[PDB]
Symmetry: C3
C-alpha cells in the first residue's frame, strides 16, 4: 500500500532481502575459516540492514513529506539513505576484501561513498530546487570518481591474484558499475527529481536495484571459490 500503491514493492523488497539473508546464513553454517567467514558476516549484515529499512518504510517510518520552494510536495522515503549509508560501505568492504585491497584504499573509497550518500540525502531533503539539482550533481560526480577508483585501484589490487579471484572480482565490479550507475538516473526520473514517473515506479526501480546490488551481489560473492 503506502502513499500511492508503492508499499507492495516495499513489502516484496523486505521479503526479498529477508529471503536472501536467510539463504546466506543457511549457506555459511558449515564454514570455519576466518576470511571466508568474514565474507559471510558482511554479506549477511547487508540484506539484514536493507530488510529492516524496507520494513520501516513499509510501515511509514522511513517516510517524510517535503514541500519544495516550488510549492511542489514530494513524498520522500529517507530511510533509503540511512540504509545506503551503511550497506554501500559494507559492499565496498566486501569486494575490497575480495580484491585484496589495502586498508588505505578501502578507507578512501568508503570516504568517497559516504560523501556520495550524504550529498544525495541533502539533494533529497532540500527545499530549494536549484539546491536539489546542484547536490544531485555533486553526488553523481562523487559517484563517477568512486566507480573509477573501484576499477583502477581495486583492479590493480586484484591484478596479482589467482584466476578465480580476478574473475569473481570482475563479475562483482560489473554488477556494481551497472546497477550503482542507475541509482542517480532513478533519482532524476522519479518524484524527487523530474517526476517523469511517480512514487510507485520509482519505488519499484529502487527495489529492483537494491535486490540486484545486495542479494544478487551477495549470491555471486558467497558462491565463489575465490572467498574459500
Amino acid at each position: 500500500l503506502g502513499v500511492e500503491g508503492e508499499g507492495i514493492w516495499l513489502a516484496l523488497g523486505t521479503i526479498g532481502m529477508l529471503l536472501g539473508m536467510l539463504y546466506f546464513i543457511a549457506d555459511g553454517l558449515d564454514v570455519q575459516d576466518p576470511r571466508q567467514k568474514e565474507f559471510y558476516v558482511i554479506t549477511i549484515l547487508i540484506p539484514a540492514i536493507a530488510a529492516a529499512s524496507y520494513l520501516s518504510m513499509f510501515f511509514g517510518f522511513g517516510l517524510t513529506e517535503v514541500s519544495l520552494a516550488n510549492g511542489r510536495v514530494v513524498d520522500v522515503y529517507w530511510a533509503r539513505y540511512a540504509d545506503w549509508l551503511f550497506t554501500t560501505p559494507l559492499l565496498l568492504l566486501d569486494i575490497g576484501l575480495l580484491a585484496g585491497a589495502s586498508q588505505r584504499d578501502i578507507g578512501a573509497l568508503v570516504g568517497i561513498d559516504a560523501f556520495m550518500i550524504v550529498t544525495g540525502l541533502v539533494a533529497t531533503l532540500t527545499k530549494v530546487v536549484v539546491a536539489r539539482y546542484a547536490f544531485w550533481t555533486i553526488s553523481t560526480i562523487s559517484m563517477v570518481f568512486l566507480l573509477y577508483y573501484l576499477v583502477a585501484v581495486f583492479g590493480e589490487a586484484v591484478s596479482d591474484a589467482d584466476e578465480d579471484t580476478r574473475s569473481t572480482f570482475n563479475a562483482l565490479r560489473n554488477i556494481i558499475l551497472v546497477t550503482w550507475a542507475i541509482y542517480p538516473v532513478a533519482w532524476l526520473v522519479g518524484t524527487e527529481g523530474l517526476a517523469l514517473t511517480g512514487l510507485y515506479g520509482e519505488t519499484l526501480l529502487f527495489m529492483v536495484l537494491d535486490l540486484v546490488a545486495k542479494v544478487g551481489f551477495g549470491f555471486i560473492l558467497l558462491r565463489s571459490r575465490a572467498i574459500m
Copy 2:
C-alpha cells in the same frame, strides 16, 4: 524534574556516571603501559558519554513526544539510544580487547550491536503499534545473536589466555548477559511497550541497568590483574 518526577533519576544517573568517570580517571593517572592505558581510555569514555546523555535528558533535551496511531502519547527519551549507539560498541570493544578477540570478530559483534540499537530506536519512534512490537522483536532477536556470539566467539578467543584473564572475562561476560538481557524487558514493561509501569519506574530501571553496565563493568575491568 521531568514529565512525572523521573528527572531525579536522570540527576542521580548523571552524578553516578560522573563519579564513576572520575574514579576511573583517578585510577588511571599512573598507568604507563599502552594496552592497559587503552582499557582506561575506553572505560573512561563510556561513562563520560552516558553522563552527558543523562544530563541532556535531565534538561529535557533528547525528549520528544510521540503520538501513536492507537492515540496513546508516549514520552520518549531518545537520547538514550544515541548514548547506547556508541557506548555498547565501546563496551564490546573493551571486553573484546580483554578476550584477545580478533579485529574481525569484534567488528562483527559491533555490527550486530549497531543493528540492535538502531532497530530498537525505530521501535521506540514508530507510530504504528504493530511496527513498534515488530521492531522490538527484530532487535531482541539481534540481542540474542549478539549475546551468543559474545559467549561462544569471545569465550573461545579467551580460552587460551591466563587464569586471571579468563576469570575476569567470565565476570564481565556475566555482567553483560544479565544486565543487557533485562533492557528489552524494561522496554516492554515501560511506557514505550506494555506500559505496566510509568515513565518514572522505567527511568529508574534504565538508570540502574546503565549504572551496573557501565560503572560496575568498568570497576570490575579496571581493577583486574588481567589488564596489567
Copy 3:
C-alpha cells in the same frame, strides 16, 4: 544573502574550500607512493566535505530556528556540526599519521574529538539557557583535554622522527592549537552564546577559522617534504 546578510561568507567559504580542494587535487595528480597518497586523500576529502557543508548552508539547508526559554530566537546553522563531526577527526588522522602516532592514540583523540563536537551540538540546539552554557563548558573542557593530548601524546610520538617531520608537525600542531582554541570563543561571543555580535559576524569568524584550519593546514601539510 543570508538571514542577516551572512550568505556572503557562506558563498566565499564554499568557494575557498572548493579552490583549496582543487589545488590539492592538482598538486597530488602524479603522486604514486602510498603514504603520501593517504595524506592527499584525507586532505582533499576535508575541504570537499566542508565545501559541500557551506554550500548546503548557503542554500539555507542546515539552518534551523531555536526558541530559547529566555524568549530569544536564535538562527542556528547546525550543518556545521555535521561538517565538524567528520572533518575534525580526519584532521586529527592527518596529523597523527604525520606524527607516527599509534592506532590507539589516534582513536583516543578521535573519540574525545567526537565527544567535543556532539556536546557542542547539544549546547547549540538545547532550549534551556543554563544547559547551553553547561554543554559549552563540557565541550570546551574536552577540547582542552584533546589539545593537551595532541601536544603530549602526538609530540612524544613524533619525537623520534627526522627534523623535517618534527618541524612540519610543530607547524600543524600550532595551527590546530591557535585556530581550534578560538572556536568556543566564537560560539560564546556569537548569537548562540552571549550574542555580543550577530549572525553575520559569527559566520564571518567561523569562515575564517574553517579556511585556516582546513585549507591553510592542508597547504602546510601537503607542501612539506616530510610526507613525501
